[PDB]
Design a protein around this nucleic acid. Structure first.
Length: 91
DNA sequence: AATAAGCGAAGTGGG
DNA sequence: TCCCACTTTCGCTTA
């Protein structure tokens, strides 16, 4: 089963939901969600995972918070903005 | 108030 | 057994 950070990285690379997520500075690995269209992306995550309940952005962002310690994704101090680690990016 | 972003014990998967 | 990698529930804080 795909990991959340890889799901997001693949979307950014493919461009398939450009109205829900986008690079801010791709060289730095910073990206941002759409305030109005992020829920459609969260829904896609839950369906790809086969989860029992409908996925929400709040539940997806909670999983993102859990990467804070191990470092794969860090929250940036700008609205709806995150940053991948160089390690995640280099793969 | 209404809305939104952000934060942090127990259940489910698949090892 | 007991960790993985989240998921789900529920409530709180700030703007």
């Amino acid at each position: 089963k795909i990991r959340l950070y890889q799901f997001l990285l693949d979307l950014l690379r493919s461009g398939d939901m450009k109205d829900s997520i986008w690079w801010v500075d791709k060289d730095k690995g910073t990206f941002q969600f759409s305030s109005k269209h992020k829920e459609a992306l969260a829904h896609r995550w839950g369906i790809q995972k086969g989860n029992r309940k409908k996925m929400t952005y709040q539940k997806m962002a909670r999983a993102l918070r859990n990467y804070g310690k191990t470092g794969e994704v860090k929250k940036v101090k700008k609205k709806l903005t995150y940053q991948f680690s160089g390690e995640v990016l280099g793969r």
